[PDB]
Amino acid sequence: QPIYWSRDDVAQWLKWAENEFSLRPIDSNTFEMNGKALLLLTKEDFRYRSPHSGDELYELLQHILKQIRLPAHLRLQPIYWSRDDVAQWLKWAENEFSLRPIDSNTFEMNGKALLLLTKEDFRYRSPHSGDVLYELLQHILKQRLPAHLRLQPIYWSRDDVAQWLKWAENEFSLRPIDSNTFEMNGKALLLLTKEDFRYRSPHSGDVLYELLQHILGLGKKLLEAARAGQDDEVRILMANGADVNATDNDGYTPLHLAASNGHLEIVEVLLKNGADVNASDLTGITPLHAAAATGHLEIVEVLLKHGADVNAYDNDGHTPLHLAAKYGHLEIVEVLLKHGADVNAQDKFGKTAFDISIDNGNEDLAEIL
């Protein structure tokens, strides 16, 4: 059975299939592992290794299949692995699966940071044994912020970004990070792609990038379901602790989602528990911008009451009034005007709010006065 195969046995199976199925020739270095390691690999890992014939090789192994043992020093959970423990795990799995010699510098981090890395980060660090060193962790996993930076990353300062790095270095046992590695503001740090993080900090940029993603949002991912209106679940989530200013994959806070779905109970409890009433969506949309278009006047009055920029502008230069006038909501438009809405909507096409009401044929909204 393939479980008993060695690196030599794996390689012979490759040259056999290369002749039997007339696959494009592949170097034995493509799969330098024992049969136990090969099993841990997913079909996507087979594809990445030998693109020309990885698919069929995987299916062959599966067709052949149809016809733990962690050291005591590393028996603890990976979240508690120190940086030294990770090195032994790399060296042990190397001898356990007969892999290419993994350098200790490959994973210069604690056990928590190792969990933050995605499968791709493992592959970049260990191009010869990363996938095996990744799925093994998952099987092991199956077996058994500082107050100075508690603000949302979008509002972090250049000095704040530096302290975040220093905190991350001590928190995840990372290598010394220079502060000039991310000499920018939190907004600029968000704009950087994961490839930029890997280039700025080759030792820890993959960890640092993922760290920022978690700060931007598990409990928050559940709390964002406040859009659905599960008020009791929102209280329960906040009671357990959650970033009230979390951001989804499109950059929406629980407030954005609750305001757009008409949950004044949620729209008020989030503000009381610390919600950015003027939070800027990726499109520059504010909670008011959302509530105005969705016609939730009560939420509109609340946001304006709890401090909302009646004259904010999205990425297309649209004020809440413009969004209101685009969907009628003359009542909401009146509230915005009563709270100091700009008559010059200053649209990206220069259109004013009245101009939007004229194109929509809403004479009542056009009759602003």
CB 366 within 8 A of CB 358: yes
Q: How far is residue 316's CA from residue 294's CA, in Å, rounded to a whole number?
A: 18
d(CA 289, CA 259): 9
Contact 291, 259 (CB under 8 A): yes
Q: Are residues 136 and 85 in the same domain?
A: yes
Amino acid at 358: I
Judgement on whether residues 162 and 187 belong to the same structural domain of the protein: yes
CATH code of residue 113: 1.10.150.50
For residue 203, tell me if it sits in a domain.
yes
130 domain residue, yes or no = yes
- The answer to whether residues 50 and 30 touch, using CB atoms and an 8 Å cutoff, is yes
Taking the C-alpha atoms of residue 268 and residue 274, their distance in angstroms, rounded to an integer, is: 10
| Experimental technique of record | X-ray
Q: Is 301 part of a structural domain of the chain? A: no
Residues 85 and 113 in one domain: yes
Indicate whether 51 belongs to any domain. yes
Structure tokens at 237: 């989530």
Residues 59 and 14 in one domain: yes
Contact 31, 13 (CB under 8 A): no
Q: Which helix H or strand E contains 141, and what residues bound it?
A: helix 130-142
- Burial class from Cβ neighbours inside 10 Å (0-12, 13-18, 19+) for residue 13 reads buried
Task: Indicate whether 121 and 171 sit together in one domain.
Answer: no
Q: What is d(CA 9, CA 11) in angstroms, rounded to the nearest whole number?
A: 5
Indicate the number of domains in the chain.
3
Q: Are residues 60 and 78 in the same domain?
A: no
Residues 47 and 95 in one domain: no
Please give the resolution of this entry in Å, rounded to 1 decimal.
3.6
Does residue 138 lie in a domain region? yes
Residue with tokens 């975040």: 164
Domain that holds residue 25: 2-66
Report the distance separating Cα 188 and Cα 195, nearest Å. Answer: 15
| Angle ∠(141,104,70) on CA atoms, nearest 5 | 35
Question: What token pair was written down for 180?
Answer: 């000039």
If you count DSSP H runs as helices and E runs as strands, how many of each does the chain have, helices first?
A: 22, 0
Q: Note whether 155 and 210 are same-domain residues.
A: yes
Query: Is the four-CA dihedral 298, 303, 304, 305 of positive or negative sign?
Result: positive
* 79 and 59 within one domain: no
226 vs 204: CA distance, rounded Å: 34
Tell me how far apart the alpha carbons of residues 17 and 158 are, in angstroms, rounded to a whole number. Answer: 56
Domain boundary among 168, 193, 216: 216
The answer to whether the beta carbons of residues 129 and 33 sit under 8 Å apart is: yes
Of 173, 188, 216, which residue sits at a domain end? 216
> Among 142, 164, 181, which residue terminates a domain?
142
Tell me if 76 is assigned to some domain: yes
Count Cβ atoms within 10 A of the Cβ of residue 368 and give its class: 0-12 exposed, 13-18 middle, 19 or more buried.
middle
Is the domain of 116 the same as that of 177? no
C-alpha triplet 175, 179, 182: angle, nearest 5°: 100
Q: Environment class of residue 139 by beta-carbon count within 10 Å: exposed (0-12), middle (13-18) or buried (19+)? A: exposed
Query: Is 117 inside a domain boundary?
Result: yes
